[PDB]
Structure formats: C-alpha cells, structure tokens
Amino acid sequence: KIKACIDEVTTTLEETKFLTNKLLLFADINGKLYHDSQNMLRGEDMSFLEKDAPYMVGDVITSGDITCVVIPSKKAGGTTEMLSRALKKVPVDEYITTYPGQGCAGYTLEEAKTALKKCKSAFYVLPSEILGTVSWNLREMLAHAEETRKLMPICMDVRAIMATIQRKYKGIKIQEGIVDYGVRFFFYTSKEPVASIITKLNSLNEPLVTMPIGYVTHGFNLEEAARCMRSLRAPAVVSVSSPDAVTTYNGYLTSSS
Amino acid sequence: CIDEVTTTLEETKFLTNKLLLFADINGKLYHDSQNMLRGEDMSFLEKDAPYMVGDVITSGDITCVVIPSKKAGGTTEMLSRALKKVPVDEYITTYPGQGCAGYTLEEAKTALKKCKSAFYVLPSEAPEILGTVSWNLREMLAHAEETRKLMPICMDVRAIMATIQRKYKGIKIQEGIVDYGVRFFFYTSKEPVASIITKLNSLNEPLVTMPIGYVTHGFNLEEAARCMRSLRAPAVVSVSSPDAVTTYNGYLTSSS
C-alpha cells in the first residue's frame, strides 16, 4: 500500500520518521542497490549486503532498520507480476522507500506504483540536464568534438555515419570502445543494450557529445531514448534531429515516465 | 487481420505463399520462424547483417522483420512499431517473440492485430508424452547417478549445495559440467533462464531437472513452465508435491 508520497508539500521526511525508522531498499542479483535506494543512504554501513551475495530474486536482507529486497530486472525480462511477488516477501510493516526498478529499460513509474500498492506493507514513497540539448548535424558534432577533445559516442552499425567518419578521418581503425583518431570516439553496437552503454559511459565519467542513445539504433522512438538518457550522469551535449525536436525531447526528459 | 489456424504449414500454403519470419539483431531467426522453413536458401539474411530493430528483409516470398527482444528489455509498443514496418499483405506466420522470457501470446496477438496485414497464424511449439515427476533432491540424485543423465542445478541455492557437498564429499563446485558421482550442470541465478535453456538445448542430452528459473530467477511455477516449453532436450522434470504435477502439466500444455 502507498500511504503517502513524500513530496515535501503534503508530506515531509522528518515528519514520516515519527511513524517508522525502517527503510526498504531495492537491490539487484549482484547486491548492488538501485540508484534511488542509494540516494536514500546517509553514511550507513552497507558492507553486509555484499557479505551474502550473489542473491536470488526475492531475497530479503536486513541490518538494523534497513531492509533490502532483491527485485527482478525488467531489462533482463522481469515482469510486473514478478516485481509484485518479490515485494510480497518483505515482512509486513511501515517503510520509507522509493519506486522500485527505475530507470533505463527498467520498470515504468506506473508499474512500480502498482507493485507497491499491491504490497501488504505501508509505504512512504520518496520521489525519483535541459541546458545540454542542441540540434547539430554530424558535421557540427564532429567539429565540436575535435575542438573540445570530448568523447563522442557513435553507433558502429549506422552505415551512413561510418562512411562519413572513414572519409573524414582516413585510415581510421574502427573497433568497439575508445578509438582516438582525430576525434575521441566511443564506438558501440546495436547488439549491446542501451542500459549497458549508459553504464559504461557513466563509469567513464567524462564530457560527451552524443545523439540520444538507442534512438532508432536500438528500436527506441524519441520518447524512449529520452527516458533512458535520464540515467546518463556524465556531462553531455545531446544532439537531436531538428530544432523542433529540442523542446519535444526536453519535455520527455523532464516528465515522469 | 488475424485468423488463428488449426491446420499445418504445407496445408496453409494452398491459401497463400508469403511467409513472415521473425529475426533478431544478429539475423538469426526465432525458433517458431525457423520451423516454418523447408530447405529455403537463407544466406541472404546474413548478407546484410547486423540489423536494427524494424529492418525488413525480403527474398522471394519470404519476408523477415527484425523484432525487439523482451528478454533484453523490449516492450509491446516497440514490438508493434517493428511490425508496422512490414508491407501490408497476406502472410502465413507465427506469434512473434515467443520463447523463454519472450513476449506473451496476448502481447504477440496484440502486435499482429495492431498490424494492417492479414495473417494465417500457425500454432507455437508447446505440447500427452510428459516426464513430469515429483521427486525430492535425494530421489533426483539417485536417478541421475544410476542413469548417468545430466542434472542441471542452480549453484546459488545454498541448501541444495550443502546436500550435494555432503553426499559427494570432495566435490569441486564450478560453473558448467562437473562429473563427480552425478554429471551435474551448475548454473547461476545471474545467467538468464533463456540462456541456460539455449545451453541445454545445444548440449542435447537427457536431463533430470527442476523447472528452470522457478524461485531462482523469480519465476512462479506457471512462468517456469512457460519457459520450459522452449526446452527441447529430453528431460525428466521434478516439481514439489504430486499435487503440483497436474498443475504444472496444465501450465505447460496451455496457450500463453
């Protein structure tokens, strides 16, 4: 059940803390917390969560007032029914939590809400850059990346883009990952899932100039590409098709699923 | 649009000639689409690989569409959009994206119904001849040791590992094949079900196993059964109680 959303308007954190001290965190099979659950921590010792890893979906781990549940991953085939069932394994109580299974190709906000509402526990739910969206063509993007020395993610499987690159940067040895030849490229495939490309770029944590990842290449429309791009944390200049798409994209990026 | 058929492929070919096959990014066909072939030259499908979701490839009367994979995050909306790229016509086809952790029958039906093309839908591979038993671990191990059958086991189930290590003292537990008293096939809860199923289908040998993914990967019995339809290697499958045998067989024999 969802007792309240902690929007700071209607409900506040310090006031909810009178009701319960218990937190419900969401983890993956590897014992790694979902980003929203990680942002709920304030220097608590989370070492205990790796002491018993790897986990099975539905595994419940408790240390003091922190409870962690191992949830199914949507980007690996997990359904809403599987999500609700992993939540039913949590001992019935009052918890401060977030929407489970957010973001790139993860569960939608409505699916996360449903799973929390279906649960028998009472939940106090905490809620889950625009300045970077441009409308530059490939030429303009390449010129920017060569001048700034920024990393430029590029889908290796877009034939028209590869021909342009090979003609502009003659003798380029195209290979997966980092290729520093005129421009510092980051070559990725349409085979590698978007969430995986995003994790690799988030890890590399450096300035990027890119198109919205997965748009067309991985079967995403603009909205779906934007929703996945929310999970990109590395500083990025993001180029959309037309100037008309800039506002559209910003709208999808700024919304709630 | 749709006309679900009780009749065979060779029989349906009297109605129309065009086939709609479903492929992945690598240009490899989905199992149901591969079973629709009768020695046709499929080399052309590799000539232009890798593909993007939505790519349409035609040679003669065979049309292939690159569909999104549900077991990799694909949605129904993505599936319907890839299908809208297929030229409007009459096709003999199957339900797209069937398989383990693939799209459900209702999601596949919806995507085909959303499409403007007219379909003659051949049934999926699913079902009398069943080896569903209700054996406990000890019984399963005794059977595997005497028959020398391969016994898939989830390495991350602590209680199962303790039993194994106590029965087969000195066992060096490692991923994959470990031949020590029983020929085990150790897998992780990290590896997806469809991937374990593919590895076992490839090894193609007699198995004695519990329904793959049940509990370990978050599946309830119904979901584990639905994934088990994709298992083709000969298998003895053990469920909890004798009461679960019929329940499981029901889920295995059913539609979705």
Numbering used by the authors:
A (entry chain A): 389 to 516, 524 to 652
B (entry chain B): 393 to 519, 524 to 652
From the article:
The most prominent such domain has been identified by bioinformatics as part of non-structural protein 3 (Nsp3) of the virus and appropriately named the “SARS-unique domain” (SUD). SUDcore turns out to consist of two subdomains, SUD-N (Nsp3 residues 389–517) and SUD-M (525–652), each exhibiting the fold of a macrodomain. The two subdomains are connected by a flexible linker (residues 518–524) and a disulfide bond. Instead, we have demonstrated that full-length SUD and SUDcore bind oligodeoxynucleotides and oligoribonucleotides that form G-quadruplexes.
